[PDB]
Design a protein around this ligand. Structure first.
Ligand SMILES: Nc1nc2c(ncn2[C@@H]2O[C@H](COP(=O)(O)OP(=O)(O)OP(=O)(O)O)[C@@H](O)[C@H]2O)c(=O)[nH]1
Ligand SMILES: Nc1nc2c(ncn2[C@@H]2O[C@H](COP(=O)(O)OP(=O)(O)OP(=O)(O)O)[C@@H](O)[C@H]2O)c(=O)[nH]1
Ligand SMILES: Nc1nc2c(ncn2[C@@H]2O[C@H](COP(=O)(O)OP(=O)(O)O)[C@@H](O)[C@H]2O)c(=O)[nH]1
Ligand SMILES: Nc1nc2c(ncn2[C@@H]2O[C@H](COP(=O)(O)OP(=O)(O)O)[C@@H](O)[C@H]2O)c(=O)[nH]1
Ligand SMILES: COc1ccc(S(=O)(=O)Nc2cccnc2Nc2ccc(O)cc2)cc1
Ligand SMILES: COc1ccc(S(=O)(=O)Nc2cccnc2Nc2ccc(O)cc2)cc1
Ligand SMILES: [Mg+2]
Lengths: 427, 419, 124, 428, 419
């Protein structure tokens, strides 16, 4: 039925801010809230005029939440849905989870419930957050534990922002990542990683943006997320509701992390070429360059696959298109599982943000896959970690806010487990 | 989110009076009056360094401590003299002695309170106080002695908030008191325990930057102050301007220091006196161009933050930063991953189209400490001038007890050249 | 490679359908513990509430040092006070009696002229 | 802050009289107290004078002697107007060339009055610093009363440094045979109540006046003028406020490394007779036994702290390149455990000399204060005299006479023995 | 700072009357009247020897004691007769006897008081009295007998102030009383105990200087008095003129005498009768030119003060003084260091362009004592003329008791020719 968004952490928030924006344009809601069931999946019809999102925004500094109740959209949300916490998280899990987090959690968890309160059958939670970085790791963690308590079945879908050398804040990033991901993993249902690097790569090859902004990268994530939620905002076949999300991607409660791949990304300026063919964009979904977590699944296997199309498309091609992706390409399916390709078409042609960077398309595809090679990210992370912790590099700051030396051991010890879990699915 | 400033002791106060009028120019402040400039950014982060009073006006959050009138009336009758709040000055009257013990125990603690008493009223006024920063000499007493005390009284009141200092570690050329090793060593100990970051400005470097590379013949305490003031501007920028990161001074600490004891940064500057990007990068990573007297050669970099100034495309700043982590790939510890971060602010300093500044947690720093502790143990030897402290009620072994403590900090920076 | 495709769901504005392509071919989170996130706060206290009681120390040392300066200063003054007039009230006592033992050495060859002067009052 | 002078003893006094004179000409004060030079109100030269009444400029000084004669000369010839009638104390009967007398017998009486008058002066001082005690080493009240003073000053004034300027007695220009006794007698009581002590060998000064000044057989008031200068160059630091040496602890924090070893070695720069010299040359003059100021030789003994005190027209740019070459073509000689010194103090004030004096006006003069271990040459050259009289109780009885003790003579020499050992025991 | 003068006994009075008028001339005093002279110095130190009365006038601080009228009317009817204050004269009436005992016990003590009664006035008039000096014969009674007593009464009244005497030790040629040895010895004893300095003027020398070197045939008590008067002038000068030292007479004593008992000076003079610097120096240090009969050969100098008169450059006086401590280097005890001091006064005596005078603590003096005690024990032998004293109430053994005491002082000077 319904569907609450939570966005925690400066990244979490901006990603949100810029995909809510895209929900709006897609649903022809003017910033004031008024538009002149269905899309009710995400918004509540409040008062008589308005259209408020079912969303909460949390951050432990004002700064970023302040920018939202500044520039239009200022009108969209409700003053109470945006929570802000005066003192920072300061780039560590410890602080967010235990010290500066302990305080604000009771208020956030309350406000969420205020939103749950006007929902005759609320479905789940879409938690957006930064992987490394202060409150994104720490407070998100504390959230999911608690949400897991106040909300029994009720799925949780996380959209993590896997941190990248080139566009990063913090040195201690690896620690927080491996820290959270550990607490966080058994309270979540399916989890969409987003490699910042990956996205910054796309913006350099495909979008031509010399040195891309956050709000550059963000618009792009916007799109992919909008393409994944599409299913339940409009309503149409396959991933019609949140449970179907795990049913189709996660055959093993632990292995959450599917691999996303947006279809045609091209810069307005190109906005008038000849359009791209149902065939070609499918055959784009298979390409490390068009990926979304820098890895390579030609070497690792696949264990469930999902072509999520948007636009003007009759299946009779999608078929003959899949068909030939098989015959001149990398099949690669695991041991004990049909060969997937659950295929969702939504007729809703993709709109993009008006003065944006991309052009308006006729047809876009989305490809969600549960590959076993997504665990490339899982070590590329660890190795950093391993090699700091091997000298208690920054450890002390954590013991400082009052954590335990042993938590650090026993969190990594879970990634060790996972990494084994994963590659042990090979076939 | 909002920081106070203590500026104690002649060397320290002289440093700060330059500091204050350079940063005051960046923002645009008259002697008292508020704004006069075609720039706009300025006053977004003026919050951070300027508690503001009624009418226009801007007045810096500034505490000035000294144990003698002298150096204060020197500010009030000079540069931006008119600007600091009247009873934000803390007079000494007494002697200062160029003797740590005086400054830390008797003639100093003496005062302390009337100082704390002012810091209390700026800090409990500050809407969300980040932390304090302090500037001062390390040899010579009013600054190093009371100062180290000040902070030991600041922590305790405010454990809480973070603790920043530019302390000027002193040398046997451009100095005066045969005693300075003693003073400094005593403080070095104190700092190591009670600060969260300390910028090590070497006067030995400072002087060398003037005469080895500047045609500067008979260097004042003037030209040479000029460097510190410039380095402090460059260092602070991200606290007090843009909206790039937003730099918590806390954020800075937690990211810059792996190990609690080793919060010692050598700074370094771009152009100098009283520029291209490439020529700016290896000028800021040149040894002959650091603010401390070491050579970031013997000793690798733990972590380094760096900050560039002036509208120029950073698509090149990346391309060059990333270069010196290969043209020097060896000299950055492999056990901390991406341990160089850089930021860019596009509003130049007093003069100059293009600048850049370097913050450096290098174990090259061991070089400095070692060299003071080596004219210290060379003096505490047959127990030299010590009777000046003995007599003021200090302990015979308290000296060896700091030696020992510092001597550690040497052999910990040594300890971190590992694998 | 040449399909056969099942088909779940025809919709308002959508269509789904799997396409199995080559046969498959093979064979407790509950609550209690926020009593964790206070036992972490009972460290951030024990760690602070000690590097507090540790400045309690490195304070009442000031006490000690400011006070052993005065303790040892009046020690000097009120030792060097009586280092004087007890080595000067042994001095005025010294001469005065050495003056007198010159007058008693001189009254004695004066009570001697008196005993031979009235000894002239003995000769006939 | 402030700074009181005390001059006890015929020497003490005349030395004073003739450097106060020099202070005056250096500060443009007409004998008639008034200065049309900058003015005052009641800083800068305030260190040494109090701005009394509305016109005048009185020294912060007391002059004590146990005979009139010498103090009477002061309230006789102009300067008569300078001091205040109270600041000059005189005692009717003499000291008679013996410590015993000065300290115990004829001193006992006047000390209360002097110590009072001093306080009167200290009373108008918002932060008085120290005392500059000028006195004769041998000689009656200079040894004995000076001693008694310092003990008492040490009691009525806690911290408050004391700086003594002694006149180490010389065969050729001397009064008394019993000189050695007094010298070693005082110096013993005197040494643990003083902070740093400038010795002045009369011989040395008389020597300078013969080589450099060309005066066939020099007067007291000949020597005195020369002392004046040196003292004036030492006090200089804190009379205008000049770059280095800026207060009384800090000035000496520099010199004395050990509670005992007070005695630095002075060496005035260019001394030449009326009827320019290079920054380099005068520096290299400060190192020469002939230009010295206590007849010894520190090429043989070591150095433990050194202080170049320049006066006049000089940019350090040379002072540096000058020191530099003093190290490459000469006698380095620095002790085991102490940087290699050369705290360098420049005062821009060009040196003025006494008008119809003997010396000429200079462009630049240097001063060099050094704590050498060889200054203990004087310490024995004295003892040996002493030793060899006392070895027969030579004049002893005169002291036991005014009421001293045989044992004090033992236990005072027993302290120079100690000192002499202290000193030479600082060798590498 | 101010001294009194006792002048007792014929030989004494006669010495003094000459003394007074030579020194009276130096200053310039009429018979009574004050000043008449183009010199100016003079009256700075006239204080010392001249208590002054109303009007002009100057009158010497003088007490004149005798045991017969005779020698007093000799002054009052002669030279500067008019000058001494009327009841400053103490008449005897009685016999004098030329017998120590009379003068010290009976006929002398008899008077004593009326003398003391005058010294008391002058002394308690003196603003700061230095001490007394006394002139007198040693053999013959009125001067030696009462005189020794006088001083033994002066001390005790005045232990306090110092005690000076020119006593004329007598000889077997130019004398009269077979007895003098007796008288002298008895006094010698007395002096040794009760004076601080005694100038030993030998008549034996005095007579010798006239006939051995002058061609003076039948020497009066006159010519021969002349020497003493001249010698006393020379000796006193520094007490009564310049502003060189200032000479405390106390200062003199403490400096001149190592050992309390040995206060015996032989004096000596420059030119003589009724001069170059060199020829002045070895003439003053010539034996044949001493005021006492010894030879400053057998016996070294303990300490020596010397004094030169008349404007001439002392750059030469040093050069020569310093010479005779090498040309005679042997004969100054090495155990007292710089034991010759000399001073210069630039205002000549009566007549004479250039003079000089010698004060001498020599153990050569032993020679003198020894020679009297040798005609004494040669007489006390079979107890000769003793019955003159026995009978006046004196003791048999008091004589041997003085012998013994003197005989010591001999063997103490001997004792000091040491190492
Ligand atoms: N894609 C994307 N990543 C971001 C953005 N902002 C920060 N990040 C990444 O998120 C990580 C830092 O997380 P933050 O959200 O800044 O940390 P936080 O504690 O959650 O937020 P603060 O309260 O500002 O400290 C780094 O890996 C950054 O690369 C953003 O706007 N978009
Ligand atoms: N440099 C110098 N030394 C002097 C002077 N006058 C005396 N002396 C020396 O001082 C010593 C004597 O000290 P005095 O001051 O004369 O003795 P005093 O008792 O203190 O003074 P008086 O009361 O006059 O006896 C000897 O070493 C002399 O050489 C002088 O004017 N200048
Ligand atoms: N760069 C800088 N350093 C100084 C300055 N003044 C003094 N110093 C150094 O600091 C030390 C003494 O500091 P000082 O201010 O005199 O100490 P305090 O006044 O007692 O606090 C000396 O060793 C100098 O090298 C200054 O003007 N600028
Ligand atoms: N030089 C000096 N000595 C004299 C004079 N008259 C006597 N004498 C000596 O002094 C001794 C006697 O002194 P005198 O005056 O008769 O003793 P008094 O009169 O009883 O005190 C004789 O032995 C003489 O040698 C005198 O005229 N001048
Ligand atoms: C190299 O490791 C890091 C990473 C991030 C930081 S930061 O988020 O705290 N800000 C920062 C990055 C680069 C340069 N300067 C920064 N801030 C800053 C703040 C205050 C200062 O006085 C100096 C620099 C600091 C050090
Ligand atoms: C040789 O030892 C000394 C040193 C100094 C003195 S002095 O300070 O007392 N004056 C003095 C020096 C040289 C010659 N005569 C002196 N005074 C003096 C005073 C009274 C006299 O009847 C004779 C000499 C005396 C003896
Ligand atoms: Mg200073």
């Amino acid at each position: 039925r319904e569907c609450i968004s939570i966005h925690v952490g400066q990244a979490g928030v901006q990603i949100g801010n810029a995909c809510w924006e895209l929900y709006c344009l897609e649903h022809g809601i003017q910033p004031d809230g008024q538009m002149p069931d269905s899309f009710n999946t995400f918004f509540s019809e409040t008062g008589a005029g308005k259209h408020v999102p079912r969303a909460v925004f949390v951050d432990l500094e004002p700064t970023v939440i302040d920018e939202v109740r500044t520039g239009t959209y200022r009108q969209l949300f409700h003053p109470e849905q945006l929570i802000t916490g005066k003192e920072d998280a300061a780039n560590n899990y410890a602080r967010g989870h235990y010290t500066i987090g302990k305080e604000i959690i009771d208020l956030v968890l309350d406000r969420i419930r205020k939103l749950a309160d006007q929902c005759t059958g609320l479905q789940g939670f879409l938690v957006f957050h930064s992987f490394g970085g202060g409150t994104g790791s720490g407070f998100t963690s504390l959230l999911m534990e608690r949400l897991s308590v106040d909300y029994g079945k009720k799925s949780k879908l996380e959209f993590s922002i896997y941190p990248a050398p080139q566009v990063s804040t913090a040195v201690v990033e690896p620690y927080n990542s491996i820290l959270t991901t550990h607490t966080t993993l058994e309270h979540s249902d399916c989890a969409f990683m987003v490699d910042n690097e990956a996205i910054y790569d796309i913006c350099r090859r495909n979008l031509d943006i010399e040195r891309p902004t956050y709000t550059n990268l963000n618009r792009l994530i916007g799109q992919i997320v909008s393409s994944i939620t599409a299913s339940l905002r409009f309503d149409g076949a396959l991933n019609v509701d949140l449970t179907e999300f795990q049913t189709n991607l996660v055959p093993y409660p632990r292995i959450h992390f599917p691999l996303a791949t947006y279809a045609p990304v091209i810069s307005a300026e190109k906005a008038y070429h000849e359009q791209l063919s149902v065939a070609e964009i499918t055959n784009a979904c298979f390409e490390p360059a068009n990926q979304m977590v820098k890895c390579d699944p030609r070497h690792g296997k696949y264990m469930a696959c999902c072509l999520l199309y948007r636009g003007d498309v009759v299946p009779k091609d999608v078929n003959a298109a899949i068909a030939t992706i098989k015959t001149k390409r990398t099949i690669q399916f695991v041991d004990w599982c049909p060969t997937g390709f659950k295929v969702g078409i939504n007729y809703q042609p993709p709109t993009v943000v008006p003065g944006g960077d991309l052009a308006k398309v006729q047809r876009a595809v989305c490809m969600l896959s549960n590959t076993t090679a997504i665990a490339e990210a899982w070590a590329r992370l660890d190795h950093k970690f391993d090699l700091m912790y091997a000298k208690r590099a920054f450890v002390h700051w954590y013991v400082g806010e009052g954590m335990e030396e042993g938590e650090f051991s026993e969190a990594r010890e879970d990634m060790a487990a996972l990494e084994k879990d994963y590659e042990e699915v090979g076939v | 989110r909002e920081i106070v400033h203590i500026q104690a002791g002649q060397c320290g106060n002289q440093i700060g009076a330059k500091f204050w009028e350079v940063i005051s120019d960046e923002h645009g402040i008259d002697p008292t009056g508020s704004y006069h400039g075609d720039s706009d950014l300025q006053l977004e982060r003026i919050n951070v360094y300027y508690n503001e009073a009624t009418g226009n006006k801007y007045v810096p959050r500034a505490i000035l401590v000294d144990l003698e009138p002298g150096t204060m009336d020197s500010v009030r009758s000079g540069p931006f003299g008119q600007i600091f709040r009247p009873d934000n000055f803390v007079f000494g009257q007494s002697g200062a002695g160029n003797n740590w013990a005086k400054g830390h125990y008797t003639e100093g603690a003496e005062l302390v309170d009337s100082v704390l008493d002012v810091v209390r009223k700026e800090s409990e006024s500050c809407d969300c106080l980040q932390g304090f920063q302090l500037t001062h000499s390390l040899g010579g007493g009013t600054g190093s002695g009371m100062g180290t005390l000040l902070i030991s009284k600041i922590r305790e009141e405010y454990p809480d908030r973070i603790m920043n200092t530019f302390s000027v570690m002193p040398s046997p050329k451009v100095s005066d008191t045969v005693v300075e090793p003693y003073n400094a060593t005593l403080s070095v100990h104190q700092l190591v325990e009670n600060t969260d970051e300390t910028y090590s400005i070497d006067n030995e470097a400072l002087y060398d930057i003037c005469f080895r590379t500047l045609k500067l013949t008979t260097p004042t305490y003037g030209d040479l102050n000029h460097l510190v003031s410039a380095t402090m501007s460059g260092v602070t920028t991200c606290l007090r301007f843009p909206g790039q990161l937003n730099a918590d001074l806390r954020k800075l600490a937690v990211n810059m220091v792996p190990f609690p004891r080793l919060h010692f940064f050598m700074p370094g500057f771009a152009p100098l006196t009283s520029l291209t990007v490439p020529e700016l990068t290896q000028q800021m990573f040149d040894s002959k161009n650091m603010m401390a007297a070491c050579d970031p050669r013997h000793g690798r970099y733990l972590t380094v933050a760096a900050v560039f100034r002036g509208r120029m495309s950073m698509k090149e700043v990346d391309e060059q930063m990333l270069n010196v982590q290969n043209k020097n790939s060896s000299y950055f510890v492999e056990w901390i991953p991406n341990n160089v971060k850089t930021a860019v602010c596009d509003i130049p300093p007093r003069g100059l189209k293009m600048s850049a500044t370097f913050i450096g947690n290098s174990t090259a720093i061991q070089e400095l400490f070692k060299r003071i502790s080596e004219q210290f143990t060379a003096m505490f030897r047959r127990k030299a001038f010590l009777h000046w402290y003995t007599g003021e009620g200090m302990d015979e072994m308290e000296f060896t007890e700091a030696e020992s403590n510092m001597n550690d900090l040497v052999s910990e920076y040594q300890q971190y050249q590992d694998a | 490679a040449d399909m056969e495709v099942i088909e779940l769901n025809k919709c308002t504005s959508g269509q789904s359908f799997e396409v199995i392509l080559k046969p498959p071919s093979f064979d407790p989170s509950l609550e209690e513990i926020q009593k964790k996130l206070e036992a972490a706060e009972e460290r951030r206290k024990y760690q602070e509430a000690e590097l507090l009681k540790h400045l309690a120390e490195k304070r009442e040392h000031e006490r000690e040092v400011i006070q052993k300066a005065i303790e040892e200063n009046n020690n000097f003054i009120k030792m060097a006070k009586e280092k004087l007039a007890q080595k000067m009230e042994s001095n005025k006592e010294n001469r005065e009696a050495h003056l007198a033992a010159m007058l008693e050495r001189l009254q004695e060859k004066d009570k001697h002229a008196e005993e031979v002067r009235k000894n002239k009052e003995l000769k006939e």
